[PDB]
Symmetry: none
Subunit: 83 residues, 3 copies
């Protein structure tokens, strides 16, 4: 296994965009390179959270060097345009 599945829902759209990334670990900045549209966005990723009752959160990630959480083996991101 030399890869990870990276899917994100984009600016509201219902069908998420899916791609494979070589590495087993992905950073925000790598994820940012898959995006095609310029502008200001916030990025969230499903992550398990003991501290929440329905198990899941969308963790906001901000720093490029940061390693994105993995939910059930995949990276599930939400990309939201600001404003």
């Amino acid at each position: 296994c030399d890869s990870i599945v990276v899917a994100y829902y984009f600016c509201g759209e219902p069908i998420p965009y899916r791609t494979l990334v070589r590495g087993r670990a992905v950073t925000l900045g790598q994820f940012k390179e898959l995006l095609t549209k310029k502008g200001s966005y916030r990025y969230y990723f499903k992550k398990v959270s003991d501290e929440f009752d329905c198990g899941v959160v969308f963790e906001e990630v901000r720093e490029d060097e940061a390693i994105l959480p993995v939910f059930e083996e995949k990276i599930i991101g939400k990309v939201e345009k600001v404003d």
Copy 2:
């Protein structure tokens, strides 16, 4: 399978530059800024060819941080200066 970039910067004149690899194709000032360990006010320059003259490439000052750093001969060569 090329998947990451070399980022070296000279830090306040200390000759020996600090070297690291960054995953991805291109790097922004803000990502570069996350590799730095010391707090404070700094300016940042990066080698990158100019179309002026002798012994000449430039050190381009970058400040935005969603700005994509120039690449000199395939690497990112930065100069980090503390504002005195």
Copy 3:
């Protein structure tokens, strides 16, 4: 729309000049002085057209800083020398 000016200076003899863009139409010595990172006593010169001979052009010494820096072929080319 234009918006900015290119400001490059050679610093203490270092060959590779440092390059930045400055917002606005024209730049003053005092604005130029704010780009500099190192403290101390310096003199500042800028290429500019001249009406004297051999190699055609001069380095005008500027000191006021309310003064507007000359523009050589659309850019500001400065020489910064530490007073030794």
